[PDB]
Structure 1
Amino acid sequence: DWSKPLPPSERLEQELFYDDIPVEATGNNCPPHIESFSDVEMGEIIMGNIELTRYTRPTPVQKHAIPIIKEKRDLMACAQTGSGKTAAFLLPILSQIYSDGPGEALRAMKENGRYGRRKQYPISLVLAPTRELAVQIYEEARKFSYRSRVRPCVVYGGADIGQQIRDLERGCHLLVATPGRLVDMMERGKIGLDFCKYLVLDEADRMLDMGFEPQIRRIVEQDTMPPKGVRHTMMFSATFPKEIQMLARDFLDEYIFLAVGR
């Protein structure tokens, strides 16, 4: 069902569509890396969209992070920007979702709430420090969710929350958001973190530099999100100061530390 692609759409494909660096990797029973996307199975939809995006081979961070996430192991990864981090986590996550489906849980619930008052339960949550990074992540998600049942969404401050609220209502299996706006959404009862199995923190060090830790601890520890060990968590940070080390200690479980040249 959720594994079978939908009929193509010329209109969308229009809209939608340095290496060999040594890597450090610490942790228990760390899953082996891939040299090509076909080394592991991610389904027709993913492989189909990888072709459309013209991704020949995985980048370094993609080579080690993808199989680790596929194996449902928590991850802490220090990689520079512009290294393919985004896809490194969206491909395996989206692949997992297509394979498993939404579940009879979120399925037998697609019809709740009232007209103009629907609560959404994202299966996946991605936190970014800025509207720019959030939008990028979001665009990459649309390309990989092309011809799939997954509907990506993105919310952030600095723009009307009204339009954003109306977009969420239409459905949201994967949510990209800046911490501030997401907290707003939750207080307004528009978002529930009860079924969130995938949590990604992109550029965590940048988020703390901006003082987003309170809102993030609020989002992850002071609410309804499944705890570590149950949910699958991934952290991406270019630097690794003590604050980030502590943030990883609290949010990650028996994780793998991945350093791509830094």
Structure 2
Amino acid sequence: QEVETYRRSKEITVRGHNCPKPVLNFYEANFPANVMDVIARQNFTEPTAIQAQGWPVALSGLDMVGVAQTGSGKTLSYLLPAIVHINHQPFLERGDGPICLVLAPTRELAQQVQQVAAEYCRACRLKSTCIYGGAPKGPQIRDLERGVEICIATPGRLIDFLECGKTNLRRTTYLVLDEADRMLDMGFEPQIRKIVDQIRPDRQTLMWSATWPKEVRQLAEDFLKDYIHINIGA
């Protein structure tokens, strides 16, 4: 396995049934033209180790957990397959909720992901929005009502909105839990549960974490299906 040479090099450990081979370069991912336009402008030389192994897993439709240090490039690891997903699901109709739901523990990390996502949404003509607590409800409710394919959210504000019927998850087929361990450290487990229970069963779900403790591992087993576990580090 040329694979095992590459994984071993990049300190990639994979666990679970039938993980696809890692993609050795950007071109092999076969992301659509508009996304490539935006990737070329970032002057990356190469895929990061989790993009390498993570992308093909995500693009295959499989559930997974990606464990890597802050800075290993996981945002793109779930975002970019999200775009492909959206391209393969029907067109967004008046009043449809989001197709892709990215949950994040804090306002700041929610906004970071919106920032990364902005350029690709614009190149791909997708609409997205950052939902977070503390800030004016008005603009956020506007965005959700005009319709977004992508909704990046912190749990509390999302709940409030669902309960008020200002959006809904009956189209959410691609679920992301960024910074899951932090999300659990800050005590959001009941809230994340209350959220997912409203998500139709055929969802692909992807968790991302810098660490792999008991609490997170248990969340994975309750929420994921036959998941792949990717580790990055010695």
TM bin (shorter chain): over 0.9
- RMSD of Structure 2 on Structure 1 (CA): 1.4
Structure 1 counterpart of 2:98? 122
Runs of 4+ in 1 over 4 A off after TM superposition: none
Aligned equivalents of 1:185, 1:237: Cα separation in 2: 26
Name the structure 2 match of 1:258.
230
Counterpart amino acid of residue 92 in structure 1: P
Q: How does 1:98-137 map to 2 (within 5 A)?
A: 98=87, 100=88, 102-103=89-90, 106-107=92-93, 110=94, 119-137=95-113
Report the Cα distance in structure 2 between the residues aligned to 1:190 and 1:53, rounded to whole angstroms.
Answer: 35
Deviation at 1:203, TM superposition (A): 0.5
8 Å Cα contact 1:53/1:143 also seen in 2: no
Within 2, Cα distance between the matches of 1:258 and 1:161? 37
How far did 1:164 drift?
1.4
* Cα distance in 2 for residues equivalent to 1:244 and 1:184: 25
SS at match of 2:122: coil
Aligned-pair identity in percent equals 46
Q: How do residues 184-199 of structure 1 correspond to structure 2 at under 5 angstroms?
A: 184-199=160-175
SS of the aligned residue for 1:39 comes to coil
TM-score, with normalisation over the residues of structure 2? Answer: 0.92
Does structure 1 conserve the Cα–Cα contact (< 8 Å) formed by 2:179 and 2:208?
Answer: yes
Q: Secondary structure at the match of 1:37?
A: coil
Matching residue of 1:10: none
| CA displacement at 1:66 relative to structure 2 | 0.7
Given candidates 172, 190, 193, the residue that maps to 1:214 is 190
- CA shift, 1:241, in A, is 1.4
Could you say what secondary structure the match of 1:38 adopts?
coil
For residues 152 and 39 of structure 2, the distance between their equivalents in structure 1, rounded to whole angstroms, comes to: 21
* Bigger mean CA deviation after superposition, 155-164 or 141-150: 141-150
Maintained 8 Å contact 2:114/2:152: yes
Matching residue's letter, 2:149: H
Q: What secondary structure is seen at the aligned counterpart in 1 of 2:175?
A: strand
Separation in structure 1 between the aligned mates of residue 30 and residue 61 of structure 2, nearest angstrom? 14
CA-to-aligned-CA distance 1:145-199 (integer Å, 9 cap, x gap) = 2222310111100111122112222221100000011001101101111111100
Residues in 2 aligned to 1:191 and 1:149: alpha-carbon distance in whole angstroms: 21
The aligned counterpart of 1:226 is 200
Which sections of structure 1, spanning at least 5 residues, go unmatched? 1-19, 111-118
For 1:52 and 1:120, how far apart are their aligned partners in 2?
32
- Matching residue's letter, 1:211: G
1:120 offset after TM fit, Å? 4.2
Give me the whole-angstrom Cα distance separating, in 1, the residues matched to 2:56 and 2:225. Answer: 17
Return the offset for 1:45.
1.2
The aligned counterpart of 2:14 is: 25
8 Å Cα contact 1:128-1:134 kept in structure 2:
yes
Q: Is 1:44–2:16 an aligned residue pair?
A: no
Give the superposition deviation at 1:133. Answer: 0.4
Equivalence for 1:138: 114
2:217 to 245, 248, 251: 245
1:157 to 120, 133, 149: 133
Aligned to 2:80: 91
* Amino acid aligned to 2:21: P
Task: Report the number of matched residues.
Answer: 226
Matching residue's letter, 1:147: A
Structure 2: gaps (5+ residues)? 1-8
* Inter-partner Cα distance in structure 2 for 1:76 and 1:190: 30
Distance 1:260 1:120 in 2: 37
Cα offset, 1:238, TM superposition: 1.3
TM-score by length of 1: 0.83
Q: Which residue matches 1:62?
A: 51
SS at structure 2 position matched to 1:145: helix
